[PDB]
Structure formats: C-alpha cells, structure tokens
Amino acid sequence: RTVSQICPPPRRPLTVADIRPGMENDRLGVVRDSMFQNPLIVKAELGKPRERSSSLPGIDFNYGLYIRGLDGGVPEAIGHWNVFKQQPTCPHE
Amino acid sequence: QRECISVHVGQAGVQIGNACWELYCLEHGIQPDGQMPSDKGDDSFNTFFSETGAGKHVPRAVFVDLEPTVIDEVRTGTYRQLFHPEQLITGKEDAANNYARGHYTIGKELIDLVLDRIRKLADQCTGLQGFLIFHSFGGGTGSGFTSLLMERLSVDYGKKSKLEFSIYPAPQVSTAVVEPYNSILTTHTTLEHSDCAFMVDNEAIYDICRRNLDIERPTYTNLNRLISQIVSSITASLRFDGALNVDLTEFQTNLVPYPRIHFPLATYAPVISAEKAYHEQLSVAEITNACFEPANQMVKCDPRHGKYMACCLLYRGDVVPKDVNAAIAAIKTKRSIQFVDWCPTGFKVGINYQPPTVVPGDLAKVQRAVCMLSNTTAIAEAWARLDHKFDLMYAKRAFVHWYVGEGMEEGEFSEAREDMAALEKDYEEVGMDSVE
Amino acid sequence: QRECISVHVGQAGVQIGNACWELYCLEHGIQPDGQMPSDDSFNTFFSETGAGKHVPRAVFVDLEPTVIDEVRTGTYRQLFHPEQLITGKEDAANNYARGHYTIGKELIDLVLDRIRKLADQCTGLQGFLIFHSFGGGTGSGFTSLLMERLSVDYGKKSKLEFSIYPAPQVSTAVVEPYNSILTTHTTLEHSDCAFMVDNEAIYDICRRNLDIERPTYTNLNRLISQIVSSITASLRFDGALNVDLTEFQTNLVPYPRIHFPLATYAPVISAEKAYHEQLSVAEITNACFEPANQMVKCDPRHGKYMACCLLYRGDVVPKDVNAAIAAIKTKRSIQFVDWCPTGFKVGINYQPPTVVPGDLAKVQRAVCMLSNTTAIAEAWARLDHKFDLMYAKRAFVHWYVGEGMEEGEFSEAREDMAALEKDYEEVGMDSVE
Amino acid sequence: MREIVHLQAGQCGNQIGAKFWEVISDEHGIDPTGTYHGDSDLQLERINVYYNEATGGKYVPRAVLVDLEPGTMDSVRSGPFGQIFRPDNFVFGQSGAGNNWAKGHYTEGAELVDSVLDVVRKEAESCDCLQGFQLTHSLGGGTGSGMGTLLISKIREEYPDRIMNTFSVVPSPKVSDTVVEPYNATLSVHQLVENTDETYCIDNEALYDICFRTLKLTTPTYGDLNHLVSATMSGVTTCLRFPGQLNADLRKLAVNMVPFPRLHFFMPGFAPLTSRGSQQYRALTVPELTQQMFDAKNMMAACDPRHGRYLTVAAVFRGRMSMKEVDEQMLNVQNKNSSYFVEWIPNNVKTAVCDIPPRGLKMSATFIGNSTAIQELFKRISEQFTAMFRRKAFLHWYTGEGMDEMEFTEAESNMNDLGNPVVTRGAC
Amino acid sequence: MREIVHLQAGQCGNQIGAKFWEVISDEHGIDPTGTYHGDSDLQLERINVYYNEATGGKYVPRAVLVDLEPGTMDSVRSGPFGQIFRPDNFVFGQSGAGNNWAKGHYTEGAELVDSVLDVVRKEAESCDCLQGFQLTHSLGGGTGSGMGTLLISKIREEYPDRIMNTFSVVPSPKVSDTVVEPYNATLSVHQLVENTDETYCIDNEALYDICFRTLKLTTPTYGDLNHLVSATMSGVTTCLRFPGQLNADLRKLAVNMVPFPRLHFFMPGFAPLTSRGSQQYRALTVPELTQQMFDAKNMMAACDPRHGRYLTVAAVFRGRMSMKEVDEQMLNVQNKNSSYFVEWIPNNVKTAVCDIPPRGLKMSATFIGNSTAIQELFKRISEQFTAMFRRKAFLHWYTGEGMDEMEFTEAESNMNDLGNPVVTRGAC
Ligand SMILES: Nc1nc2c(ncn2[C@@H]2O[C@H](COP(=O)(O)OP(=O)(O)OP(=O)(O)O)[C@@H](O)[C@H]2O)c(=O)[nH]1
Ligand SMILES: Nc1nc2c(ncn2[C@@H]2O[C@H](COP(=O)(O)OP(=O)(O)OP(=O)(O)O)[C@@H](O)[C@H]2O)c(=O)[nH]1
Ligand SMILES: Nc1nc2c(ncn2[C@@H]2O[C@H](COP(=O)(O)OP(=O)(O)O)[C@@H](O)[C@H]2O)c(=O)[nH]1
Ligand SMILES: Nc1nc2c(ncn2[C@@H]2O[C@H](COP(=O)(O)OP(=O)(O)O)[C@@H](O)[C@H]2O)c(=O)[nH]1
DSSP: OTTTSSSSOOBOOOOTTTOOSSSSOOOOSSOOSHHHHSTTTOOOOSSSOOOOSSOBOOTTOOOSOOOOOOOOOHHHHHSOOOOOOOOOOOTTO | OOEEEEEEEHHHHHHHHHHHHHHHHHHSSOOTTSOOOOOOOOOSSTTTBOOOSSSOOOBSEEEEESSSSSHHHHTTSTTTTTSOTTTEEEOSSOOOSOHHHHHTSTTTTTHHHHHHHHHHHHHTOSSEEEEEEEEESSSHIIIIIHHHHHHHHHHHSTTSEEEEEEEEOOSSSOSOTTHHHHHHHHHHHHTTTOSEEEEEEHHHHHHHHHHTSOOSSOOHHHHHHHHHHHHHHHTTTTTSOBSSOOOHHHHHHHHOSSSSOOOEEOOBSOOOOSSSTTSSOOOHHHHHHHHHSTTSOSSOOOSTTSOEEEEEEEEEESOOHHHHHHHHHHHHHOTTSOBOTTOSOOEEEEEESOOOOOOSSSSOOOSEEEEEEEEETTHHHHHHHHHHHHHHHHTTTTTOHHHHTTTOOTTHHHHHHHHHHHHHHHHHHTTSOOOO | OOEEEEEEEHHHHHHHHHHHHHHHHHHHOOOTTSOOOOOOSSTTTBOOOSTTOOOBSEEEEESSSSSSHHHHHSGGGTTSOTTTEEEOSSOOTTOHHHHHTSTTTTTHHHHHHHHHHHHHTOSSEEEEEEEEESSSHIIIIIHHHHHHHHHHHOTTSEEEEEEEEOOSSSOSOSSHHHHHHHHHHHHTTTOSEEEEEEHHHHHHHHHHTSOOSOOOHHHHHHHHHHHHHHHTOTTTSOEEEOOOHHHHHHHSOOSSSOOOOEEEESOOOOSSSSTTOOOOHHHHHHHHHSTTSOSSOOOTTSSOEEEEEEEEEESOOHHHHHHHHHHHHHOSSSOBOTTOOOOEEEEEESOOOOOOSSSOOOOSEEEEEEEEESTHHHHHHHHHHHHHHHHTTTTTOHHHHTTTOOTHHHHHHHHHHHHHHHHHHHHHOOOOO | OOEEEEEEEHHHHHHHHHHHHHHHHHHTTBOTTSOBOOSOSGGGTTOTTTEEOOTTSOOEEOEEEEESSTTHHHHHHHSTTOTTSOGGGEEEOSSOOTTOHHHHHSSHHHHHHHHHHHHHHHHHHSOSSEEEEEEEEESSSSTTTHHHHHHHHHHHHHOTTSEEEEEEEOOOSSOOSSTTHHHHHHHHHHHHHSSOSEEEEEOHHHHHHIIIIISOOSSOOHHHHHHHHHHHHHHHSOTTTSOOSSOOOHHHHHHHHOSSSSOOEEEEEEOOOOOTTTGGGOOOOHHHHHHHTTSTTSBOSSSOGGGSOEEEEEEEEESSOOOHHHHHHHHHHHHHSOTTBOSSSSSOEEEEEESSOOTTOSOEEEEEEEESOHHHHHHHHHHHHHHHHTTTTTOHHHHHHTOOHHHHHHHHHHHHHHHTHHHHTTOO | OOEEEEEEESSHHHHHHHHHHHHHHHHHTBOTTSOBOOSOHHHHTTOTTTEEOOGGGOOEEOOOEEESSTTHHHHHHTSSSOTTSOSTTEEEOSSOOTTOHHHHHHSGGGGSHHHHHHHHHHHHSSSSOEEEEEEEEESSSSTTTHHHHHHHHHHHHHSOSSEEEEEEEOOOSSOOSOTTHHHHHHHHHHHHTTSOSEEEEOOSHHHHHIIIIISOOSSOOHHHHHHHHHHHHHHTTSTTTSOEESOOOHHHHHHHHOSSTTOOEEBOBBOOOOOTTTTTTOOOOHHHHHHHHHSTTSBOSSOOTTSSOEEEEEEEEEESOOHHHHHHHHHHHHHHSOTTBOSSSSSOEEEEEESSOOTTSSEEEEEEEEETTHHHHHHHHHHHHHHHHTTTTTOHHHHHHTOOHHHHHHHHHHHHHHHSTTTTTTTO
C-alpha cells in the first residue's frame, strides 16, 4: 500500500530502463533489476545519495508525527460550558 | 524594510553564493529567469530582491572575484539573466593564495568599484539591516580582499550589523600550505571589526554528508547547499512571520558576551537524505538533541572538551513552542553539555511559521528545521591547532618571500601571533569558574 | 508508554531476532514492510512515524557483515531503520579479546549512540532485551562491553538477557568453554536477569514433541521467538494477572547473584495432533513441570526449585491454574527449597499465540514456565570441568592473549565461577539450625 | 447529610471498586452515562453518600483511582461503567510498582502521594459531614499494599476524627499469586494495626469455596469473585443510604464490633447465596437466612471460624421484614453455638435492618464477624514470612530501594504482638 | 463613564493586547469591521470605558501600538482583528529592537518617544476622567522593558494621580527564551518599583502548566497561552464597565491591595479553568470556584502560595450568584488556612460581584493576589543577575549604548531592597 500513500507514484529505484550511458552504473553482462535494489552490488551514485533498496513515496510527503489535534483550545475551553445534555427517550420497549 | 547586503568574495564565497541563490529562487516565487508567475500581495520578496518596472526583481548581492572563469560561470550558466550584468564584479588577475596580493597590490583597481556598488545597493534600502560577507580563510582573494573590504565597510557603515560566513581551515587535509599564513592575517584583521563570524569546516561537512546524508562521492554543489540552508534558516525571521522573530541586532547583542569573542558555530536540523526520513520521527526533542550531538556540528571541535557560552535556536516550520521549551529543560538538565558557570540563562528561542523548501536533491522535504548557533569554548582547540601549524611553518621563514616581496611588511606575522595569543588567553580566561 | 528496547548481538541473537520480528509483525498486524493496512498495543515494541511505517525498537549490531546483509536485502529491509542495522568490518573469530578488547571500539560508540537515541524516544523505559549466545566471540565480548556500558549509564533500568547456552554434549566450536566463562564473569555483575536456553533441548523437543526430524535453525529460533512473545505479553496486551518486567526481575531473582532462569513452553503440537487431544490446563502445567520439556538439558530431579513464574495465554480461567498449582505443589517429585513456601507467580493473558506459517499449531492455551532450579549448577560445573581441562596446559590461549587479554583474568573468572558454585550450594542447603 | 469518600489503589483494588461502582449504580438505578433511570422515588434521597451532585443530572461517584501502572486506568475506563468517574481523579503514574512494598511506599508512590492527597483533599472538602474513607486493596502484592498503607497513614494523621474502611484481599493458604506475598502482608498489616478503624479480610480461596460449593459455578471469573466482594461492600453501607427501622451506619457498627483499639479485623459474609439451579426450590425466610449466615461456607476469609471464638457478630439484614425472629434467632445462635461465643461479652450480636434489599431479590443479609479465627491467618502469614526472612530471600530489592533491617523485625514484632492478644482473649 | 487607555509595547505585550481587543470584542459585540453586532443595550451602556465612538457607530478602540521594528506591527495588522485599529496610532520605527534595554531606553528608542507621547496625548483629552493606564509588555527582552518603562515614567510624569496597570510577562525559572532576561528585567523593575500602582507579573511557564495539568491541551500555541492573560485582563476591569453589587474601580483595587507603597506586585488568576473532558463532569458553584481560585495551579506565576504568606486577596466574581456564599466560603478560606494569611491584616480579602458572566459561560472569578511569594521570583532573578554580573558579562553592548556599572549596582540594590519589605512582613 506504499503507492496509495501520496498521489504521484513512489520514487522507484533505478531499474534497467533508465541506465544512461557515460554514467557510473553502466555494468555490462546480464543486467537485470535485482542488483540495483541489492545495496552492495550498488556502487554509489557519486554525486547523488546512495540508491534505495526499495520504492519510497514522492517529493511532497511530510515527515514525522505532525499532531493536528482536535481540541478547540482555550477559546473552546472558556467560551463554552457543556451543561449536562441527555437523550433519555428510552428504547426499553 | 528589513534587508541585508550579501557580498560574495572569492571562489568559496561565490560558490556558496551560487548555492544560496539557487535556494532562494525556489524559496520565493522567483523562477530562475527573474520574473514571478504569480497572478497577484507579497512584501517578503523585498528583503533579498528588488522590484523593477515590470517583474525582473534583481537581488541585493555582489559577486566579487579577482579571477575570472567563475564570474564567467555565473554569466555563462543558468542564472545570468537574474543578476545585474554590472553586479558581477570580476577582476582580471588571480590573487594566487596570497594575502599580500589580496590586500596590498591588486585590490586598488577594484576596491573603489566594489565600495561604490555596495553604496548604491544600500541606496535601495529603507532599513538596511546587516552585511553578509561570504568567504574562506584560504585563498588570496577570500583572505586579503575580505580583510580590506571589512576594514573599508567598518569605516563607512560602522554602526551596522556585520556577519561573516566563512569556511574555516581544515585541521587535517587543507587545500593550501598558506592556509595558516592567510587565516592568521584575515582573522587578525577582521577580529576588531567583525560583529560576528560563523565558521564552516569542510571536514565536518564531509563527515556529516557521509554519515547522515549517506553519500560517498558528492561534490561542492552538495558541500555549499547545507550552508545555503543554514543562511536561509538564519535570515528567515526578517523574511516571514513567526512567533519569536529575531533581529540581526538581537543576534549580535545576543551571541557575543564580550567584544572580541564573536565566533559561534552553525548546526542544521534534520539533514536526513529522504531515503531514510520515513524510518524515524524528526520530533522537536530529537532535533534539539541532534543539534547538540557531537557529530552534526558544522566544524570539527569537541563539545565535551569545552563549554557552551551562549547558543541560539531557530526553529522553522510547524513547531509548537512549549515542546521547544521542554526540550530546552531536558537539554539543560543533561549533564554532558557543560556551560560556563557565569551564565544560567544561555538559550535562545525563535519560531518561524514557514517550513523549509528543498531544491530537488539530497535533503528530505521536512516541515521542521532548527538552526543552532553556539558561541562556545570548543573552538580554542582548533585555534591552537592552526596556531601551532603557523608556528612550525613560520619558525623556518618558509613561504615568507612571496609575502614580503609583494609590499607586505614582514613583521605582521609576529603581532598576528600575539593577537592569537591574546585570543587564546581570553578563551582560557572565560573558562574558569567563580572563586571570588 | 511501557516501552522496552531490544539489542541483538551476534549471529545467534540476530537470527533469534529475525524469527522474533517475523512473529511480532503477524502478532500486531503490520505487514512485513512496516505499514498497517487499515493502538497502545504496538507502542510497546514498535514506534510510530510518518503515514504508518512502524519501526521496531531494535539495534541489530554485529562485528561481521552478511549476518545483517540478509536483513538488508530481504523482505525486512523496510521494517528497520537503515542506520540501526549496524555492521562492523572484522570478525571476532571466537575471541573474547576480539569481541570486548580489540574490535569493540569501532562499534561501541555507534551502538550506544543508537541506544541513547532509542531511549530518548521512550517515555517510559522499563528495560532491554539483549539477544545472543554464550558461544561466539561477538556474543561473548561485545555483549559484555554493552552490559558494562549500559549498567554504567542506565543503572536504575532493567536489562533482561536472552542467552543461548553452550551445549554440554554437542557444541559447535572448540573455545566455547573459554568464552562462556569469560562472558559470564563480566555479565554477572551487570545483568539483572538472564533467561538462558540450550540448543540441544530445543533439538530434543523438536524431535520428540513436534513430530518432525528436519526443521532447520529458522524453526529452532522460532520457539525462542515464541518464548519471548509469551514472556513479554502483559506488557503488550491486557490480562487477568498482568506481569510486568520489573515483576519478573523481582519475583524470579532470589539473591543478587542467582539470576539465571530456565524457560519452557506449553503445547508445541504440529497440526496433526490438535484434534486428538483436549489440552486442558492441569495437563499443560504438568507438561511444563515434567523433567523433559526444560529448554536447558539439566535434570530438575537433581536439584531444588526456588521460584517459578507461570505465564498462561489465551482462554484460561484463573481457577484452572489455581487447581494446577495446587496439584503441582502436592506432587512429590517437584522438590522446593524449604525457605521459600510461595513457589509460584501466576500471570494470565487473554491473547492466544499467533500462528506464523510454519509448524506450530493453533492452540487456545499456552503457558511459558520459567524456573529457577538448583540443577543449573550441574551445568555450570559441566562448563567448569571443560575449562579446567582446556586450561590445564594453555590450549588456545595465545590467540586471546595476543589481542590484548591479560592472563590473570582467566583465573579470576575461574574462581568467580567456583564462587558461583559455592553460592548455589549455600542457597541449596537445608535448615539445620 | 453524610458522605463517604472512596479511594482505591492497585489493580486488585481497582477491580474491587469497578465491580462495586457497577453494583452501587445498579442499586441507585444510575445508568452508565451517569443519570437516574430508576423506579423508586426515595431511591434518590441519599444518593449523596457515595455520589456527587453535578449541574444537570449525571451524578459522579466520589472515587479517586490511583495505580502506578498506567494500564489499569485504561482497563477501568474501557470497562462497562467506566465513563462515570471524574477524569481529574485518574491519578496514574508513569512507572510500574513491580510487586514491591519498598517501591510502593518509599519511591514514586511517595512521589505521587502528594497529588493523591491533593485530590482526596478536594473531594473531602467538597462535603458536609464526613464519616470517612473507603480503600480497597490486596494485602498481598504491590501498589495497593505499600501505597495503600502510606495513604492510610497520611489520611489518618490528617483526619483523625474520621473512620477508615479498608477491604483487603489477604494472602491465601492455598496458592500464592505473588511470591513476596507475606513480605508485603506483614509490612502492610504493621501499618494497618495503628491506622484504620475497619479492616475486612477477604480470601480468594474462600471465594472459590463459596462460588463452587454454594453458588455451583463451573468457570469462576474475577468479575464474579469480586462481585461477591461488592455485595458485602454494598451491604455494610446501606443504613445511611436507605431508610428503615433500627438504622446502624458505619460508626454505629464500629462502636459495637471492636472491643479493643487494635482488634479491628473483620471477616465478611453474604448469605442469600443461591445457585441458579437451586434458586427455584427456595422458600426465603429468616431461619434459613440466619442459618446460611453462620456456617463456614459463606465466610470470605480462609480460616474456618470454628477454630476460634466469636468476639462480635453483626447482621445487616436488608428487605421488608419483621424482626422478632431476627431477635430470637440470634438468641438461638448464642444458645446452641455456645462454645464459639465469648462469655465476657454477654449477648455479643448486633442487629440492623434496612427497608429495601438489593434488586433482583426480596431479602438479603450481610454478615460481619470479629473472632479469634483471624488468629490462624495472621499466624500462617507469620511463619510464611519467617521462612524467607531467616535467609534473606527477596530482601535485596527492599534494601536497595531503601528499607532497613530493623524495621522488618519491628513489623514481625507487631505481627506477634497482634497474635498474642487474639490468643489470650480467645482463651480468657 | 470612566476611561482608560491601553498601550502595548514590544512583541509579547503587543500580541497579548492585540488579542485582548479580540477577547473583549466578543464580550461587547463588535465584529472585525467595527460595526456593533450584539444582543443587548446593556453592553452598549458603557462602550466608552475602552472603545471610542466613531461616526456611523463604527467604534474604534483607543490603543497606541508601539514597537521599534515594523514586523509585529504587520503581524497585528494581518492578524484576526486587523481592521479595527486606528491608522494614526500605528507609531513605529524603521529600526531594530536588539532586545537591549539601553537601546529601548537611552538611544534611538527614545527618538520615537516624543511621537508616542503626542499620540497618547491625542486621546488624553478626548475623554472625561482618565482613571488608569493599561500597558502590556514583557519585563524580559527589549522594547517592552526599556521603552515600555520609559513610556510609563513619562506618562506618570505627565499625569501624576491616575492608577496605572502593567500586564508584564516575567521570566521562568525552568527555561529562558532570552539570554539577557536578568539584564533587561532588573533594569525594567528598577523604575517599576517607584512608579506604577498595579503590576501583573505573568510568567510564561505557568500558562503551559495550566494548559498541561488543568486545561489538558496537547499543542498549546501562543494564542492559547495569551488568552488566559487576556481573560484576566478583561475580568479585572468588569466592575468598571458592567453593573453589579460591590462595584470596585481600579483605584479601589489599588487602595485595597496596596498595603505599603512599594509592595504592589500582584499575582493574576482566572478560575473557571476546566479541561474539555472534565468540563463535562463539573458542577459549577461559587464554593468550587473559590476552591479552584485558591488552588495553587490556576495562578499564573511561578510563586508558590504554600511558600508565600499572603497579604491581600481580591476576587472579581462575575455572574448572577447570591452574595451570602461568595462571602461565606471566602471567610472559610481564611478560617481554613489562617496560618498562610497575615494576622497584622485581619480581614485581608476583597469581594466584588459583577452581574454579567463572561460570554460563553454562566459565571467566572478573576483572582488577584498580593502575597510574599514574589520574593522567590525576585531572589531567583537577583541571583541570575549576580551570576553574570560577577564576570561583567554581556555588558559591552549596554556600555556602548550608554550604561555604566553604578546604574546596574543601583538596580540590584533596589532589587534587594524590594525583597526585604516582602519578607520582613512575613517575619512579622
Ligand atoms: N562551497 C565551496 N567551497 C569551495 C569550493 N572550492 C574551494 N572551496 C573552499 O575554498 C578553499 C580554497 O579556496 P579559496 O580560499 O576560496 O580561494 P580564493 O578565496 O578564491 O582565493 P584564490 O585562491 O586567489 O582564488 C578550500 O579550502 C575550500 O574549503 C567550491 O567549489 N565550493
Ligand atoms: N537459534 C540459533 N542459534 C544459533 C545460530 N547460530 C549459532 N547459534 C548458536 O550460537 C553458538 C555460537 O554462535 P554465535 O555466538 O552466534 O557466534 P558469533 O556471534 O557469530 O561470534 P563469532 O564466531 O566470533 O563470529 C552456537 O553454538 C549455536 O548453538 C542461529 O543461527 N540460530
Ligand atoms: N475477586 C476479584 N479479585 C481480583 C480481581 N482482579 C484481581 N484480583 C485479585 O488480585 C490479586 C493480586 O493483586 P496485586 O498483585 O496486589 O495487584 P497490584 O496491587 O497491582 O500489585 C490476585 O490474587 C487476584 O485474586 C477481580 O476483578 N475480582
Ligand atoms: N503570553 C505570551 N507571552 C509571549 C508572547 N510572545 C512572546 N512572549 C514572551 O515574551 C518573551 C520575550 O519577548 P521580548 O524579548 O520582550 O520581545 P520584544 O519586546 O520584541 O523584545 C519570551 O520569553 C516569550 O515567552 C505571547 O504572544 N503571549
């Protein structure tokens, strides 16, 4: 469900699809997907951070516990008194 | 209304300038051509940008560099259109790792031009707030020209706030053998006139990028970008609206106890590389602890072998101030962070309501970052290391002939050495506890 | 709120840990990467962060790679923080000197930094779960150095040890009698309580009561993972008699030195014996107390029990275990120490064992029994005789000495274990005054 | 108007009072949401003994809940009648007592004791005429022992003219759910001697005896076990809660029960106890109610009362009854069971009658006994303690947390100095 | 009609007053755009206590906003209630505060004082009898301390016989939002000791303490922290604006809570302080209003009343409650703890009862306390001053702007000579 998190697709690790020539990960001799996710056939991107071993969500995800809360604050803590309301109307039936 | 003048001296200063203006372009709506695609209601662009007839918004800066090809990188690359073509003060002849050339013969054909430019840049300023001098303690330009420029600006606008952002010499690697000969002179000359100077050590930036960013071979584009985030976090109160808005006069009344001790150190909170920020929580307590951890400091100095004298926290983003206050209480009662005995209140609090904006690259897009700026006694070890290196290099009079045959008088190295002896004596004097 | 931090050191402890987190993901509900496909239940052994990528409170630290690289390239590469998976560069080579003295200093600062980060994000820290063996060099030396540092820093907090005992008969290395004594000499003064389990007893229970002759170590460690999940159950959930980790270390540790319990587990049936037996409470209590399901191969008849902690999980009514404890107290072969009439602590939890895809069957009642016997001193003497025979003419001692070992500490650990033998005899002697 | 303030410590005592507040809410007709949906008009007349008026109709019990483990508060909030206490009185802690009397009395318990006395002060000041306080705890185990006795000591030294009712689950001869049970018990009863005015000793083994031999249950749950405790804890406080002839409130009991200032340990009892299979063949009258009160089958302490002599008998009958038979059946009891009643208190029963019985019944009876059979419980706890104190077992925890060698022997000295008088006045 | 002008200086007091105009806009009934949108004429009865009339009924407050930096001016202008404040009394400077007392008092901060006094004088005659001077600021930091106290000094030199109250935020023992809290604050108090008649020392940490223990928040922002200050600063001046019994103006408060001319430091208080959860189960009465009024958790200072002997108490109750209880439990407070109230002042408590509750409740009670507990505040700030005065630290900015050693010595001597008359009366 890591694609359901954030609408644009997760940042996929660099597959065989991109692998540009004149670049440092330009291995020759059976090039398939899995070595680019295994972190230690992966020599680093050499100017960019180390390649991921996974697919991570995109550019517009906020990081960490961002507690929004539900209390109205002290305007709701002083500007209202919740006098006892009841819904008896008893369905004893 | 609240603006600062940013002068970028030498190769290090102008590369940090390229990185920082790269940051402010996408920090505001100013696309890297000059205009703004906003269909506007702003008044936050005016701090580091002008306003021309339609939309061009030239920035308040000056790139001065006695050698070309780097100002030509600026005027050949992507960002030429945004800058004033006459703001680019290129010289004609490199200072060649020589304070004598940076200060004594080839400054005099460019000093009048750069002073004139700084003057009529300050003319477009209702309230000018400070000077941002970006340089190193290394090469000839970034030592001698920033020394002489510092003297002339302190003569002309001496009452104003004066900030230096300088790359401190490395303790182990360095890039010049005349790093001590140039650092000794530029700090001896700028001690009396600099209001405060924040230091950066390349070794510590290498280690923090190797460890936290987890990057094995990145270049100076990634060295200077953390400094760009540092300066954008420092000069954010004058840009946005927050909770504890801090002024540059507060910074200078604040970060120094004494007139000459004016070297605090920067530190930037979460510097996680966005391939890792999913796995931890980046809360206020742990970012405040990560500021004081002896691995994220922007320079190599051991905090445990020293005492923090006064430090300032710039929380930026969605930060509730009482979590900051609780983290402050926990940090205060932690016993490994020792302070001077004469300063119970040593912490500063600032909250701004604008989250960090990240360029596509290394840093994680985080809505929270605190910049920690500590004036501390831990830099005395680095000063002693540099002074011992200067002693062992000067004791045989090596590399002195290039200095003295240029116009510099030979004996200034001596009184520079006793000036740093006085600085070491003062850093020792601030360390003893109260007996009287 | 009631958090607890696990550090996994050595290859044995690391693979115990992979079994353990394999179990815990299915127990709570987070899928192997770490997110929950949707309260205060995971906030005991797991943290919470952006979206839902829950991260365990574990430090997988080891001196060699390829033990943690399996995790870093496995399906569990997403569960763990990339920096808390800590690997060294050189192997400890069954050397307590290379685990505590020479190659400990390139890793101990980093592992304590991650420990203090995890402890910083713990509003209530009860204790630690420290997973290793008394065998190899990593789990002998780095465990000792970690316990010294954690007892110095965090002296008021609980440190629970999960130690694999070096088997008296089979073994897998030649210097385990050296390493076990060298690690227990230093962990005796620092570790609060050390749950200790032998390999060949799990071997025996798998060959007899599990009806399979070929499970590998991925199933050998799974029973220990079940033991850990059973023992830290009232901390994760709610029950009738909630038993806390402070309660274990106060009700299972008689004297300051005698802190080595033996675990055992109730039913270990294997999905082709479930529908032919009732599995009542009295019979599983007698199965835990009978002298063959003990997870350390020492005979409980040749000794005396001191204190036992029963932890029942699932649909267990409290008066069934009341009757079971009564029957165990009346049965004569279970001989208690005369100075301790209250021999039992009962704990009851309403949550049954999770069924991992494997061999353990779904049983609605399961008790983990911890015993503090005096027959464990016989196993201590079994290691001591091997140490004496090997130390008679300085076998394998130069490899230790050349890496920084001091010769007299061998003899110091020797009469420390001799002293532990006399403490066991002194706490075992009866009333004559 | 008269008030009783209810406070409780420990997981055991918290469940004691959870079932008690459920029982009292059902007796006063109070719904889980706190309002009155009842049937009787006089049923609201003395709500303000355990309950507090609040503006609109949801009454709130005057109970403060304390426990060092912050999970029992979660359990009692998630319970059935959980949304009935004030959230301010949930004085929990970020720790775990760890079955340690040292860590309940000389540590974070003594660091939270200021807050728990603050909220107790608040609820006691919000009253008009206090009889006293009600603490429910387990005498064996942590939290409710150490914090419980410390809290009793501070409240007794604060309000010396108010009575204390502690309902204590004493450790049982049959099994031991905590391995340091007599360590906790002797140290706790050391404080209970010179503090409380009414201690009630309840045993879980006796609870099993009642629910298997009399109630005929198969899977006895804790909800049932201290449902039976909630029954007697409601039955003691009924004369000051409902009208009736011959009222006897808590102090009117306590004057009659205890002859001496220290012998204040009671073993309770409830005896309209009918199994669900034999309830349909019942013929409810005073003779078999007073026969069921006086056997060793509804006695909630694990000591058969026919190993000692009764000092004082109580009988809080509930229900519309006439009472010449309630008088002469106590006559018959004192005449036949003569070898187990003292001669120096002539006619040593006390009788009280309440108009309204518990709901779902027509006539009930609460039995409170003070005898020389608590002798055996206290003695057995004394040898159970001296078995481990002779060789320093489980003592390093208490000594490390800050307790002293001499005060353990002081507690055992007071243990034996309670054992000796219940010898000499059982044998004159 | 009796009028008062409300000056706000700094960042702290600027935000406090800027949201206080919001909090009293709700009690009056004007919207952001100045149009009166209320429900009763009795609120319109005394609009001219804080609000000046303007044509079309577009009522404008009298509030001289002042700061040395035009950032907080823009913050107030872009805040919630922005189109309410007069454009003429936005007096600012194109300068930097520099959080420097010497800068705010003896430098270019004094170059705006002439304009500030001119614009204050502009509303000084558009009014009838100017009874008092509201001014909101922080003792620690710049602008509000330095220029705030020079503004106080000048306006008292210009009007000598009017009461003035300074709602001022003082530093917290626990933390520090400023490295020069002592250097700013002692120099700020040096003039306030011999000048003002009603201070209100309102620390920052007790607002979070209320929001954490009492109000039970999880993200207490600066609006939430400033709002209790605004509620107290509205409730203190309610007998001056709205009808009631036992009405008291600010000079009545000054006479009753100034025993001696220098001991006029007051502890604020507001006490219908309830959490959102326990607000349900709460039972609003004048007794428990007095209870949580005198409970040392709702007071807004780091000054322990259990460590400070009280001198004078004031309670401005608001609501339609009967007078006999608001007199009786106020008597019973002194009868309960008379050892914490002075004996040389018998009858040391003041009761005022306004008719109108604050909008959003049914009653309230603003608490005003002049006790000896401010001696610990002054002692701690004096030690914080002394620890950095021993090394002459942080002093070169002050000496460059025009300070000297003898002024700081006089300020510290006046702080010690202020701590003495607040302990020598508690020593009888
Ligand atoms: N951020 C950044 N810093 C640099 C770069 N190149 C050099 N530096 C720093 O600058 C130091 C040496 O160059 P400088 O001292 O700036 O030389 P200079 O000031 O331009 O003077 P000249 O040598 O005469 O050109 C090194 O120690 C680096 O720390 C760069 O490309 N980016
Ligand atoms: N359950 C389980 N036990 C193991 C495993 N590997 C080893 N053991 C036990 O641990 C003992 C020694 O192994 P370790 O302590 O892990 O050795 P090490 O930690 O790798 O230390 P070094 O040999 O120095 O690298 C053996 O005798 C085994 O009984 C494992 O994978 N799973
Ligand atoms: N009768 C009854 N007993 C209970 C209930 N819950 C727990 N207990 C008893 O509580 C006793 C243990 O309490 P204790 O260990 O002192 O808990 P602590 O106070 O948290 O340390 C056990 O012996 C159980 O018999 C209940 O709901 N009803
Ligand atoms: N109650 C309250 N206190 C505040 C507010 N804003 C700031 N403060 C406090 O004001 C103090 C510092 O303000 P100060 O330095 O005087 O700002 P200045 O006037 O611009 O110099 C800090 O300790 C804050 O705690 C607010 O909005 N409400």
